[model samples]
Structures are given as C-alpha cells and as structure tokens.
Target chain A: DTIFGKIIRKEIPAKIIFEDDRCLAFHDISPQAPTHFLVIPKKHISQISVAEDDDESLLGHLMIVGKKCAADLGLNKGYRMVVNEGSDGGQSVYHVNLHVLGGRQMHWPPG
Target chain B: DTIFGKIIRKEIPAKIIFEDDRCLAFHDISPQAPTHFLVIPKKHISQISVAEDDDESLLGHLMIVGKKCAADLGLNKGYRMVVNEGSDGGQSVYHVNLHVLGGRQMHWPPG
Candidate 1:
C-alpha cells in the first residue's frame, strides 16, 4: 500500500502538523531528531529524479511548507531537508516526500 | 565569502553542468558518489529555516534545476536532494544550496 496515499486519504493515521490544498506535513513515525517531519505533495510523483519540469512548482511548495513547519516546531537552531530516491537512497515510501529534520545537531556523510 | 557565492560569481571554478539566470549546478568538490553536484541560487539565502515565504518560487526553481541536472548527468538509476540549514546540519557553507547525489545507491537516515 502507498503509505503516503493512505495518509492523504485519512485512511491511515499520522501525526499531522500542517496540511494544504497541494501539500501535507506530519511527524515521521521514526524520529531521526528532536524535530522530524515530512512535507509531501498530495500527488504521487515517485521521486525527485523522475519528477517532470512541470512538477517544479509543487516541489518548491514542499520546501516552503517544510520551512513553515520547522518554524512552528521551534527548530530555530537549524534544520535539514532531505529527499531520498530509489532503494539505494533508503526511500522506503515510494511516494515523493521531503524529510525535515532539526532540533539537534546533524552529522556529515549522512547514511 | 560564501563558497557558493564565489561559484555564482565565477570567482571559483566548478565543474558546471547547468546554469541559468536564477540558479547554478556543479559537481561537488568532495563528491559522495559518481554523480554528485550542488544546485544553488544566485541570491544569498542563509538557510531554509530563515528563508522568507516569498522565496518559495526560487526554492522551487532550485528543485527543478536539480532534476534537470540529474537527467543531464545520466543519473537514470536515481538521485537524492539535500539541504543543510546550519552547523548542526553539516552546513559548512553559509549560503543555501541543494546537494544532488546519484550514480550510486543511497542510504537511509541521511546526514
């Protein structure tokens, strides 16, 4: 099943923080930091590499939403935006999503 | 000077793959994979957490550029997009930029 699709449909429950007509933000089930959430387009785009030029606007909106949510979560210190593609990138969820992580120090040479 | 700033101004040479009025894409000096590059905006934005909502369009443009560069680089397998916001997030450069990585399998819990 498309996990994000279920979240979008409200078929599966998630700790949602922000939702808009074109995007959605919620806490990650597996927290990577003190403040960890995801911002995803409502539409299924698979991954960034596969996204078309037309999808640029939606992809940008995801970044904006991530910024907004990070502020709301009080991750003023800093944050990270990560989009994993394909299995090698550790993208468990097929639906394209941006991982926003903060509230703690991040490391280099990320896993 | 911001590292990315120099690249934008042509003060520092980079293995440029794509360039436009609003953004630039180049191979990372310290690459993590065979196809690793960075997409940066011409303007100076400290980090995503501090970016203004008005910067949304520009941010979106960055994602589009990243996608385009990945295709040009022949990263058909897949790629990853990354933005580090502060010191904790491993943002050595002050200027905001997106890291586009591909040509190898990516890992989970990215840095």
Candidate 2:
C-alpha cells in the first residue's frame, strides 16, 4: 500500500473533493497551478503503462471522475489532465494518479 | 473536425503508428521529445471537458491505445499522457488528443 492507500483508508488525511467506489479526488499538497488536484483509483495500480487490459474501464472511469471533479470546482474555463508514467514522465508517486490543473495559463511542449 | 480529422480521413498524411475503430495514433509533426506522438478519438470531441458521459469508454480506450503504442515503440522505460482542454490548458488543436512524450528527461510542473 502506498501513501495514497493510507489516504483511502483514512489513515492519512486528504481534502477529498469527490469519491466513489472506484476512485478518490483530492487537492494537491504541491499544486502546479492555481487549481491543482489529483484523482486516483482505489484499485492500487502502480502505473498506467502496467495496467492490464481488464483495467480499461477503471482507467476510463478515472478521466470521467476527473472531469466531474473539475466541474464541481467550476473549471469550465479550462484545465489539463495529466498521467505521469515512469521516470521520463516525472512520476514521483508509485501509484497511478490523474492530475487536474487549471485557473492559469499553461505553456506548451508540456515540459 | 480539425487537422486531426483530415489525418483521420486520410486527406492529410500522418505517420500513423496505431489505429482501431475508435482511435488513431500518430507521430507529432513538431516533436517535443525523442518519442512524441498523439492518440485521438475518431468521434471528434472538441475537448475532454465537454465530453459527454457516453464518451467515457472511448476516452478510456484511448489510454489503453496509448499504452499499446508505447510498447510498440519500445517505450518500456517511461512516458507521459497529456490532455489539454482549452486556453488555460494550452490546447492548440480543437480536437482532443492524448500526447505521449518520452526518450528524455522530462521536467516537473509539466508545461
């Protein structure tokens, strides 16, 4: 279990905005934009690259979950959803998480 | 329909690496990394923010397609999947596309 699992189990505190049986959405402790948060699945998948075919519906569910959370935050103006894989993707966390960032301009070439 | 539509329709050429009934994967004309390509849905949704509930499976399918394409390119090391929604998200193209970037060190605070 990762730190996020602790968050899921309520062992660690997180300002969770939305949650269902499949996932959890929360504010980022280290926000990259005016609005930055993360939506991670409860399944404990390590990374997207390693996700099995059976996890497709769950992965897709995360995107919709991210969108629903964005709407809740009035992110209608615009935002970005990012999934960081292994090293080259800057994935600091071991568990897969979808990052949602908005409320400011985002540059291109995306890092 | 955007430039991606043209590429999907075969009116414009692209270095397509993967394709299925639901999506198409291709190399980015302007490379941002050693391995830069895009996976876009065939349905032509403007952006993920505006996607309807029905698009969930398709969006999830894109993620899987992205993973498969990376495996094809031997991106076993790592990569990032990005979706820019609008102005604040730096979405240059109207149609939704998932960006795959790797083969180099990617910085944090992506874009």
Q: Which candidate has the highest lDDT of all?
A: 2
Residue range B1-111, candidate 1, lDDT tens digits: 887888888898777888889888888889888878999999889787777777878888898888787778887777888999876678888999999888888776676
Q: Per-candidate TM vs. native?
A: 0.93, 0.97
* Candidate 1: tens digits of C-alpha lDDT, residues A55-111: 777888899898888878887778889998776677789999999988888876666
TM-score: model 1, chain A: 0.95
Model 1 misplaced regions, further than 4 Å:
none
How well does candidate 1 score on lDDT at residue A28? 91
Interface RMSD of each: 1.6, 0.9
lDDT of each: 0.84, 0.88
lDDT of 2 by residue, B42-105 (tens): 8989889888888878888999999989888988779999999888888888999999888887
The candidate that wins on DockQ is 2
